């Protein structure tokens, strides 16, 4: 008729080996003492032995204000109707903050089974002394898919933001690191975990900025969960299948985030240099002298897509809390307002102020030229090299529009959102091809449409590469061969001592870039083709310099200095562009094992320094084009 019920008084830190059957139920009564100030965490471990296939043990932990219950061997879901089985289950117990200063709290563990044979479990309830996290101290722990871990941080006084950094040494147990408030329960199951709070799938790295304003209890729970499968982290997979051998050893560090002097140090470093250029130029001019809207039209046909998509799409995460959508550099992302990576946006102040200053140069030069025309001298276009500021204006505005088309990319950098930032750098890379060429020929408008078509073709090839973002080896070699063919065909179009010497030093760099693209197989294709863009640009600059050099004229120092400085800055910028060029892989999990701290002035990482050197180098090359054949203001041949 009735069952045996064995009610017994148990203790902490003492393994209990008992056994139950279909007609026995074991009820253990643990107690402890909780204190207002110091907190502690009970963790229950249960482990059946040589378990039979009949019926699981069923465990119930009853507290004053919550009930937890599971069934051991725990069975978790695969993906395509697969089941994984764990002989060993553990959970920490959520307990609401205490009211009294110290009190005694009980809780009972109920073990029962419906299997008609004995089963020998192994209960053990243990106190946790490393529950609370401390600011700046690394701390390790192990957790399988059946043993979700969680710890508790609470902000000190005067810390209004921290950043949680979790880092494992191996890649293929997956994980989720959620950060929730301290209101029980705690969603730390494979299904509950993504319900609230901000989470991040991790493979080797995870980082989450947390702010005090979110949590009125001045604390939060860091919850670490390990997934049954590694598909969502790039891995591959081959009735229940035993999977109790798969741990993950982690390390959690919670350090304070920059307060306010980083912000001002970022502004007062953008403004303190990009205005240095302004003053330098305006003071140089006095010494020297006293000793239509097509770009914006295309940008407006693209902007409402870019602007609306990115603005709406950031808010989606900002209201969701799923940080696997936008591919920031989470170690260096210092949010202001609703902007997550604020520094990745000031870093585009260069392009803006530099395109603007280039325009303000061209304006003055054009009106000076028309005033000198009103002086009625023979140096209209014969004694000089025919002036056409129409394309200089184009460069000076395209730089401005680049300082906006990527400042919107760096709001949710993403797989789809990519081509915005770097494709617009081909346009400005194309114009330098035009003007230089145009600087030796009367009509280029017939080839201007062809240049627009060539840029569109490059963008289409970039789109194709982005579509096959997992580009096969055949994919890579196909582009390799077609680009070598393009180089070989382009060598002919430029046809002596140095005329053919150019080809000696061109094909080698073509091969070198292709070889690195093949061997690295970088996930990024457009930003890789950009490297070829700059390489061709610099080679063309050098070649035109060489051809100008086989005439008995003399280059004035004022542009020669520009050539050398622009070359050196392009030396820097490609370095900081290759440091981050592999830092973007398929899945946000391993697109996160390439992050890195803020390098310069606590606020800017690599990419934020490339957003600087790129603008300064391109401005330097603009001035090179403006002033390169400047000395030829007398010869009318």
Ligand X SMILES: *[C@@H]1O[C@H](CO)[C@@H](O[C@@H]2O[C@H](CO)[C@@H](O)[C@H](O)[C@H]2NC(C)=O)[C@H](O)[C@H]1NC(C)=O
Ligand Y SMILES: *[C@@H]1O[C@H](CO)[C@@H](O)[C@H](O)[C@H]1NC(C)=O
The site for a second copy (CB under 8 A) is made up of 2-3, 5, 7, 27, 55-56, 58-60, 62-71, 77, 81, 106, 108, 110, 112, 114, 181, 183, 187, 190-192, 194-196, 216, 292-293, 297-298, 300-305, 307-309, 311-313, 415-416, 419, 449, 452-453, 456, 459-460, 462-463, 466-467
Among 142, 211, 338, 512, binds ligand X (CB under 6 A): 142
Least distance CB 530 / Zn ion (angstroms): 10
Give me the phi and psi of 295, to 5 degrees please: -65, -45
Among 6, 15, 138, 140, binds ligand X (CB under 6 A): 140
Nearest to 523, CA basis, from 583, 457, 589, 480: 583
Nearest to 327, CA basis, from 511, 591, 15: 591
Q: Which does 63 bind (CB under 5 to 8 A by kind): a second copy, ligand X, ligand Y, none?
A: a second copy
32 binds ligand Y (CB under 6 A): no
Q: How far apart are the C-alpha atoms of 200 and 322, rounded to whole Å?
A: 7
Q: Which stretch binds ligand Y (CB under 6 A): 96-104, 173-181, 329-337, 550-558?
A: 96-104
Inter-residue contact 102 to 36 (CB < 8 Å): yes
Give me the phi and psi of 602, to 5 degrees please: 65, 5
Q: Which does 118 bind (CB under 5 to 8 A by kind): ligand X, ligand Y, Zn ion, none?
A: ligand Y
**Closer CB to a second copy, residue 68 or residue 380?**
68
Beta bridge partners of 502: none
**Closer CB to a second copy, residue 247 or residue 587?**
587
247 binds ligand X (CB under 6 A): yes
Among 249, 368, 582, 636, binds ligand X (CB under 6 A): 249
Least distance CB 88 / a second copy (angstroms): 17
Least distance CB 179 / ligand X (angstroms): 22
| CA dihedral over 429, 431, 432, 433, signed as positive or negative | positive
Indicate left, alpha or beta for 337 from its phi (over 0: left) and psi (-120 to 50: alpha). left
Beta bridge partners of 162: 210, 256
Q: Which does 142 bind (CB under 5 to 8 A by kind): a second copy, ligand X, Zn ion, none?
A: ligand X
- CA 232 to the chain's CA centroid: 17
Indicate left, alpha or beta for 139 from its phi (over 0: left) and psi (-120 to 50: alpha). beta
**Closer CB to Zn ion, residue 177 or residue 425?**
425
Calculated CA dihedral for residues 321, 326, 329, 330, nearest 10 degrees: 0
Least distance CB 18 / ligand X (angstroms): 16
Q: How far apart are the C-alpha atoms of 433 and 625, rounded to whole Å?
A: 10
103 binds ligand Y (CB under 6 A): yes
Beta bridge partners of 222: 151, 179
100 binds ligand Y (CB under 6 A): yes
- DSSP-derived 3-state class of residue 47: strand
Residue 379 DSSP label: T
- CA 159 to the chain's CA centroid: 26
Q: How far apart are the C-alpha atoms of 208 and 195, rounded to whole Å?
A: 17
Inter-residue contact 62 to 119 (CB < 8 Å): no
99 binds ligand Y (CB under 6 A): yes
Q: Which does 140 bind (CB under 5 to 8 A by kind): a second copy, ligand Y, ligand X, none?
A: ligand X
Q: Which stretch binds ligand Y (CB under 6 A): 97-105, 273-281, 565-573, 577-585?
A: 97-105
For residues 6-35, which are near ligand X according to CB under 6 A? 9, 11, 30-31
Calculate helix-pair angle for 526-549, 445-467, nearest 10 degrees.
150
**Closer CB to a second copy, residue 194 or residue 599?**
194
Among 10, 16, 19, 269, binds ligand Y (CB under 6 A): 19
Inter-residue contact 246 to 235 (CB < 8 Å): no
Q: Which stretch binds ligand Y (CB under 6 A): 87-95, 99-107, 132-140, 533-541?
A: 99-107
Least distance CB 596 / ligand Y (angstroms): 50
Q: How far apart are the C-alpha atoms of 625 and 429, rounded to whole Å?
A: 12
Q: How far apart are the C-alpha atoms of 27 and 8, rounded to whole Å?
A: 6
Q: Which stretch binds ligand X (CB under 6 A): 123-131, 140-148, 216-224, 481-489?
A: 140-148
Structure tokens that stand for 514 in this block = 């292709």
Q: Which does 421 bind (CB under 5 to 8 A by kind): a second copy, ligand X, Zn ion, none?
A: Zn ion
Q: Which stretch binds ligand X (CB under 6 A): 137-145, 148-156, 254-262, 573-581?
A: 137-145
Q: How far apart are the C-alpha atoms of 330 and 597, rounded to whole Å?
A: 9
- How many CA atoms does the CB half-sphere of 632 hold within 13 Å? 20
**Closer CB to a second copy, residue 139 or residue 460?**
460
Among 15, 118, 249, 315, binds ligand Y (CB under 6 A): 118
Least distance CB 20 / ligand Y (angstroms): 8
Buried b (16+ CB within 10 A) or exposed e, 357-376: bbbebbeeeeeeeeeeeeee
Q: Which helix (H) or strand (E) holds 62?
A: strand 57-62
Q: Which does 580 bind (CB under 5 to 8 A by kind): ligand Y, a second copy, Zn ion, none?
A: none
**Closer CB to ligand Y, residue 99 or residue 245?**
99
Q: Which stretch binds ligand Y (CB under 6 A): 69-77, 95-103, 360-368, 409-417?
A: 95-103
Q: Which does 138 bind (CB under 5 to 8 A by kind): ligand X, Zn ion, ligand Y, none?
A: none
Least distance CB 19 / a second copy (angstroms): 17
Q: How far is CA 337 from CA 27, 211, 318, 437, in A?
A: 53, 12, 11, 47
User: Which positions lie near Zn ion, rule CB under 5 A?
Assistant: 406, 421
Inter-residue contact 41 to 96 (CB < 8 Å): no
**Closer CB to a second copy, residue 241 or residue 453?**
453
Binding residues for ligand Y (CB under 6 A): 4, 19, 21, 99-100, 103, 118
Q: Give the interface with ligand X as residue ranges (CB under 6 A).
A: 9, 11, 30-31, 140-142, 247, 249
């Amino acid at each position: 008729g009735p069952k045996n019920v064995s009610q017994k008084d148990a203790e902490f830190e003492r393994t209990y080996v008992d056994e139950v059957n279909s007609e026995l139920v074991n009820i253990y009564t643990f107690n402890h003492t909780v204190t207002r100030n110091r907190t502690e965490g009970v963790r229950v471990s249960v482990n059946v032995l040589n378990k039979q296939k009949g019926a699981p043990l069923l465990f119930v932990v009853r507290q004053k204000e919550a009930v937890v219950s599971f069934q051991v061997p725990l069975i978790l879901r695969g993906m395509f109707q697969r089941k994984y089985l764990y002989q060993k289950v553990e959970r920490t117990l959520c307990q609401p903050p205490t009211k009294n200063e110290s009190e005694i709290q009980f809780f009972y563990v109920d073990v029962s089974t419906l299997s008609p044979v004995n089963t020998t479990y192994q209960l053990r309830v243990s106190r946790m002394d490393d529950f609370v996290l401390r600011t700046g101290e690394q701390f390790s722990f192990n957790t399988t898919a059946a043993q979700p871990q969680y710890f508790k941080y609470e902000f000190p006084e005067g810390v209004d933001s921290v950043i949680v950094k979790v880092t494992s040494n191996k890649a293929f147990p997956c994980s989720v690191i959620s950060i929730q408030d301290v209101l029980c329960p705690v969603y730390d199951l494979d299904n509950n975990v993504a319900f609230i709070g901000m989470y991040q799938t991790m493979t080797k790295k995870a980082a989450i900025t947390v702010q005090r304003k979110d949590f009125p209890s001045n604390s939060f729970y860091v919850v670490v969960v390990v997934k049954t499968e590694d598909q969502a982290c790039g891995g591959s997979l081959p009735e229940p299948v035993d999977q109790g051998h798969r741990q993950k050893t982690l390390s959690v560090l919670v350090s304070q985030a920059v307060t306010s002097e980083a912000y001002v140090s970022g502004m007062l470093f953008c403004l303190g240099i990009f205005l240095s250029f302004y003053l330098l130029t305006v003071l140089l001019a006095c010494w020297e002298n006293w000793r239509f809207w097509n770009i914006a039209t295309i940008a407006v046909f693209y902007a409402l897509p870019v602007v609306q998509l990115v603005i709406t799409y950031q808010t989606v995460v900002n209201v969701t809390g799923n940080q696997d959508i936008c591919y920031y550099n989470f170690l260096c992302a210092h949010p202001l307002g609703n902007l997550s990576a604020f520094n990745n946006i000031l870093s585009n102040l260069g392009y803006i102020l530099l395109g603007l200053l280039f325009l303000l140069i061209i304006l003055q030069r054009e009106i000076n030229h028309n005033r000198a025309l009103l002086r009625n001298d023979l140096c209209a276009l014969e004694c000089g090299i025919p002036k056409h500021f129409g394309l200089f204006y184009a460069m000076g505005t395209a730089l401005m529009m680049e300082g906006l088309l990527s400042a919107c990319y760096h709001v949710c950098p993403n797989y789809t959102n990519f081509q915005f930032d770097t494709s617009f750098m081909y346009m400005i890379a194309g114009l330098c091809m035009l003007k230089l060429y145009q600087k030796r020929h009367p009509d280029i408008n017939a080839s201007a449409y062809s240049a627009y078509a060539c840029l569109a073709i490059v963008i289409f090839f970039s789109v194709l590469g982005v579509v096959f973002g997992k580009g096969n080896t055949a994919f890579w070699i196909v582009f390799s061969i077609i680009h070598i063919i393009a180089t070989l065909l382009l060598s002919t179009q430029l046809y002596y001592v140095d005329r053919m010497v150019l080809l000696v030093m061109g094909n080698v760099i073509n091969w070198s870039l292709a070889a690195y693209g093949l061997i690295m197989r970088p996930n990024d294709f457009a930003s890789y083709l950009l490297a070829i863009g700059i390489c061709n640009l610099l080679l063309y600059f050098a070649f035109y310099i060489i051809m100008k050099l086989r005439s008995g004229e003399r280059i004035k120092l004022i542009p020669l200095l520009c050539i050398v400085c622009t070359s050196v800055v392009w030396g820097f910028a490609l370095f900081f562009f290759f440091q981050g060029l592999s830092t973007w892989q398929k899945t946000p999990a391993e697109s996160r094992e390439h992050n890195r701290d803020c390098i310069l002035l606590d606020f800017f990482d690599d990419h934020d320094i490339w957003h600087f050197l790129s603008s300064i180098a391109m401005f330097g090359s603009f001035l090179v084009l403006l002033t390169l054949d400047d000395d030829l203001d007398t010869v009318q041949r």
